[PDB]
Amino acid sequence: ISHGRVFRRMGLGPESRIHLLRNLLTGLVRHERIEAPWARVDEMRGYAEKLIDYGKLGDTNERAMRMADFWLTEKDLIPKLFQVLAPRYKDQTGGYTRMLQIPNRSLDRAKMAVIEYKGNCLPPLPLPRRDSHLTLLNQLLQGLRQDLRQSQEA
Template identity: 45%
Template sequence: MRHRRNTTKLKRTAAHRRSLLANLACSLIEHGSIRTTLAKAKALRPVAEKMIGLGKRGDLHARRQAVAFLRQKDIAKKLFDEVAPLSKDRPGGYCRITKLGPRMTDSAPMAVIEWVDQPAEVETVDAPEEAAAEPTPVVAEAPAAEEAEAKPAKKKATKKAKAEADAE
């Protein structure tokens, strides 16, 4: 009997399903969020949460288990060094699934799966220190208003010129 055996098969053999989930988990670890079908996202969530659990343990055996499943040493290193420490205080629920709606081609329900504790992406602007120290000049408001009034006049002039050219 199949009591409490709730594996989402995704219409694949066991080896194909394991490879698919390993590749999806690697992509999730590498990029932080991925867009996939809803069924694959729901099948990936327990796998990704187990990987975070291994990452939080951090011992040698956990590292070997992660590499054995993911099959990519650099991704496993990123899991243990960057992704798992962000969730050290969270007892569970490391992934978030957001439904997107149907895919245009085959109407498959799509979803985004992402980490709940993602690092905030900060954009750094490399500005020269000298330019930041100098105050920016204040531009008067009146010339900008005159230019705005002049632009529609130019458009009207071009429309009149086109109308005259069409009339001839």
């Protein structure tokens, strides 16, 4: 029974799980786009979002610096977090990362995901795009919406 068990069991145990996520998070901050097994990227995505929130507290904040020190193994990333990533998202209240499933990797056919920090310099990922408004179904719904405006106005 695993009712309400939010966290996955990974690696060699609890401590190993955090270190596995920390290594993935450290790679994401440096590269801004990494690809790994889907479950691990999904497990790490929450920490990636929360790390940006600590970066918004500022480097002067002692608790935030302690968080960045632990979660960022490579210390040169800590300045990047507070001075690059955090200011980038100053306006946004969330949704810092986007996660997309990519084809299963050849060796073990593991389900794979790509996760990136929105706004990176890297070439854009081929995001899924909703159908054009000009399509037949959308045009029929656009006409319906316009009529409901006239009826509402009356």
